[PDB]
């Protein structure tokens, strides 16, 4: 379990993926040109997890960039770390997906998916021990949601024994592009419920709320939201990328975080929120204000939790504070899964900050988010509003009713396990 294959699809997918790659490239001492100028060998011990070692001792991200439009990928190529990516790993069309799930999944995306899979196959062949794939995308648009889910399905068909991990950005009316985002999201969630092992639910509502009422940003841009996202992705991948007592990999994570196959949607959390003592780190990261999914964990229960503390700190006080938070919040953890909280410490803090903490919770409170989507979905579907956009691509009403039913079922399963 060494190499991970990274896939970013659509506008949101590629923007957050670009920021992820520049953040971790900085952490590993890799510059925009792909050459290593770091000071610690710890930056290179597991660098193969995300980078291929090319000729001349250059490191190239094991990343595939996908879109049905050339714009966002042009801007990526033009960006700071744009030259770092493998040129023929850019796979894109011209037509676009029109924020339409059917276009990304059934019509437009169908033409490009095999070329994408060819690049994925080439990246996987060079792998000594492939862990699986991580995909960055949004669920509200067309390319990320429709085509990313199509890609996930085809990849699972070709690699049924590898881990499928996604960073999935959920839509909210507070940061809405079009009224059809709930449709696109519901259709995507069904796919995600069946074909991923782990999904980090990045809620645009939560990111906006954090930017507005905590970072005091009056008018939050997409870049502001993305900064939070990249901090979260760095935190959540820290133990995959650096040597630690944990020796973490995607499969161990899945096995220890996912007690029931369908309930694999995690709420990330981060502290401190930016644009600090261990007790503060622990209290903040468990604070709802620090949640990236816009759900109140005090409205549900944690099935499992995984947390990393980064910096120079006493692991003893980290243990003490984690136990203290569990005891002071005993009601919000299920009692029938013993020892369901895992903690690690990494001596290398992220850039600019001396102490930080990242949190992954498999909470039943995530049901709130799905409820939110479902309602927004039904309010339009009950009137069949905007359906012609999708029926013109060949879809039937039955498929919508099926996606709706699957998501309401998911909500009811979360509710079932919330009542122990």
């Amino acid at each position: 379990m060494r190499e991970i294959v990274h896939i970013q699809a659509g506008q949101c997918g590629n923007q957050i993926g670009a920021k992820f790659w520049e953040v971790i490239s900085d952490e590993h001492g890799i510059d925009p040109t792909g050459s290593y100028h770091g000071d610690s060998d710890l930056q290179l011990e597991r660098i193969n997890v995300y980078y291929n070692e090319a000729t001349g001792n250059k490191y190239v991200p094991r990343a595939i960039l996908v879109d049905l439009e050339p714009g966002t990928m042009d801007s990526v190529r033009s960006g700071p770390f744009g030259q770092i990516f493998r040129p023929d790993n850019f796979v894109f069309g011209q037509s676009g997906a029109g924020n339409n799930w059917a276009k990304g999944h059934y019509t437009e995306g169908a033409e490009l998916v095999d070329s994408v899979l060819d690049v994925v196959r080439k990246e996987s062949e060079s792998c000594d021990c492939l862990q699986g794939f991580q995909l960055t995308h949004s669920l509200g648009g067309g390319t990320g949601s429709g085509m990313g889910t199509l890609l996930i399905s085809k990849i699972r068909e070709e690699y049924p024994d590898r881990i499928m991990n996604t960073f999935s950005v959920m839509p909210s009316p507070k940061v809405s592009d079009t009224v059809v985002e709930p449709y696109n999201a519901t259709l995507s969630v069904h796919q995600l419920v069946e074909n991923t092992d782990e999904t980090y639910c990045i809620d645009n509502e939560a990111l906006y709320d954090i930017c507005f009422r905590t970072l005091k940003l009056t008018t939050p841009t997409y870049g502001d939201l993305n900064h939070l996202v990249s901090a979260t992705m760095s935190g959540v991948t820290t133990c995959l990328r650096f040597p630690g007592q944990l020796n973490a990999d995607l499969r161990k994570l899945a096995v220890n975080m996912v007690p029931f196959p369908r309930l694999h949607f995690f709420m990330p959390g981060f502290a401190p929120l930016t644009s600090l003592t261990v007790p503060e780190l622990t209290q903040q990261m468990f604070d709802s204000k620090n949640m990236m999914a816009a759900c109140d964990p005090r409205h549900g229960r944690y099935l499992t939790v995984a947390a990393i503390f980064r910096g120079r700190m006493s692991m003893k006080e980290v243990d003490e504070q984690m136990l203290n938070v569990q005891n002071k919040n005993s009601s919000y953890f299920v009692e029938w899964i013993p020892n369901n909280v895992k903690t690690a410490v990494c001596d290398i803090p992220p850039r600019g900050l001396k102490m930080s903490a990242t949190f992954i919770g498999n909470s039943t409170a995530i049901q709130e988010l799905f409820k939110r989507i479902s309602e927004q979905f039904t309010a339009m579907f009950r009137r069949k509003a905007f359906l012609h956009w999708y029926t013109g691509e060949g879809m039937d009403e039955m498929e919508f009713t099926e996606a709706e039913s699957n998501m309401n079922d998911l909500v009811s399963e979360y509710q079932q396990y919330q009542d122990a």
């Binding site: 379990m1 020796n247 161990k252 096995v255 007690p259 029931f260 013993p338 020892n339």
Partner: protein, 437 residues
């Protein structure tokens, strides 16, 4: 002389084996390159230590061991460590992808692909034995390899060497020092699968070793190195009778004879004293009576439980260092007066005592202080059933909801194996209750 073969499975088994073989080399005067200057018979011998070390024409003393892991990094550390030249490259066997803390992966999917290779390596070691007593198997309950692959290997060893004895050293899982949430499942699955194939099993609870390190060594957050050096001290106490000239427990069958009156009740409780920090500049060397009494303090046990509330079936005292029978007998009479030691009626109330004059050996630059005398007590007491109960309860909490079961079924197991293993454990607890009160 009769050889013994050590088998170290999974991370816990491999690292504990590293500690153990370091300690053995120190105790027998074998250097990291395998040369043993005190050995005057070159390329062979009939000595007691030859039960654990074969010899090469070049005078190299080679452990009779195989290290197995489904992942390669941990055994890589042995290949490139202080004792790299101690082992033959074929002794260290690794795969590429581990069991992912999943008993089903270790036992069925991944293990099946490597069992024949491991058996071939083990046969390669066995063919060098004039007489082979059996195997010592080191593994954790909690890991996917340590549980699943160890159970598979134990079944195959029963098939291949039915006559031979199989002794276990098992790490019982603890939240203070844990790697997986599903460690209870694995623990039960392997126990049920291994129970009829193991003749005697020494359980070490990570919680007990952790607390002993914290308490007696003043180590705030013990590492696997600390835990493993203490465990190696206990294991060395248990195997010294196999490696040195003596009269008690001089062959693997004797462990079953002396410690195990019933086949399924084959989990003796180990207690060890004294554990003293190397850093303490002031130290008061403890007498025979003191360490013997410490043997009856729950805080010094390898598993936390209360022997006062169980019954003894056998009790064995293994001393090392400045100890003569006179003091042992006096201390035993004192303790018998001062303690609650009830044996089962169908067994005699007696202790079997062994004294090795060589004091305990410590790793230079370790946390354990050098002491003039030490003692490991091995008592087969029903109180250890507490551990089983604890473990079973955790299992029950998760299995009632089928939490995580899908990971095992997806590898080819059936829920029926879960319920069958849990029933076997309930029967085991029933047996312990019947023998005890």
């Amino acid at each position: 002389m009769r050889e013994c073969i050590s088998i170290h499975v999974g991370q816990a088994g491999v690292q504990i084996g590293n500690a153990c073989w370091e300690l053995y080399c120190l105790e027998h005067g074998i250097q990291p390159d395998g040369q043993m200057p005190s050995d005057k018979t070159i390329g062979g011998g009939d000595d007691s230590f030859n039960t654990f070390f074969s010899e090469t024409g070049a005078g190299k003393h080679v452990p009779r061991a195989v290290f197995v892991d489904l992942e390669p990094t941990v055994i890589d550390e042995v290949r490139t460590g202080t004792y790299r030249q101690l082992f033959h490259p074929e002794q260290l066997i690794t795969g590429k992808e581990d069991a992912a803390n999943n008993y089903a992966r270790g036992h069925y999917t991944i293990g099946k692909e490597i069992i024949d290779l491991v058996l071939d390596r083990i046969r390669k070691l066995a063919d060098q034995c004039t007489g082979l007593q059996g195997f010592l198997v080191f593994h954790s309950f909690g890991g996917g390899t340590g549980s699943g692959f160890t159970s598979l290997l134990m079944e195959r060893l029963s098939v291949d060497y039915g006559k031979k004895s199989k002794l276990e050293f098992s790490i019982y899982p603890a939240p203070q020092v844990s790697t997986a949430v599903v460690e209870p499942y694995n623990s039960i699955l392997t126990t049920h699968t291994t129970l009829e194939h193991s003749d005697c099993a020494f359980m070490v609870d990570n919680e007990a070793i952790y607390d002993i390190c914290r308490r007696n060594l003043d180590i705030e957050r013990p590492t696997y190195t600390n835990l493993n050096r203490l465990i190696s001290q206990i294991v060395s106490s248990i195997t010294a009778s196999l490696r040195f000239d003596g009269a008690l427990n001089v062959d693997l069958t004797e462990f079953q004879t002396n410690l195990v009156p019933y086949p399924r009740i084959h989990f003796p409780l180990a207690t060890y004293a004294p554990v003293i920090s190397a850093e303490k500049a002031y130290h008061e060397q403890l007498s025979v009576a003191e360490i013997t009494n410490a043997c009856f303090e729950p805080a010094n046990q390898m598993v936390k439980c209360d022997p006062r509330h169980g019954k003894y079936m056998a009790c064995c005292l293994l001393y090392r260092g400045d100890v003569v029978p006179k003091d042992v007998n006096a201390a035993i009479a004192t303790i018998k007066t001062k303690r609650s030691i009830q044996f089962v009626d169908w067994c005699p109330t007696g202790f079997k005592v062994g004294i090795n004059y060589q004091p305990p050996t410590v790793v230079p630059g370790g946390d354990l202080a050098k002491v003039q005398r030490a003692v490991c007590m091995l008592s087969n007491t029903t109180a250890i059933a507490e551990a089983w109960a604890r473990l079973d309860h955790k299992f029950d909490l998760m299995y009632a909801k089928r939490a995580f079961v899908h990971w095992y079924v997806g590898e080819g197991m059936e829920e029926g194996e879960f319920s069958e293993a849990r029933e076997d454990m309930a029967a085991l607890e029933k047996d312990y209750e019947e023998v005890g009160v």
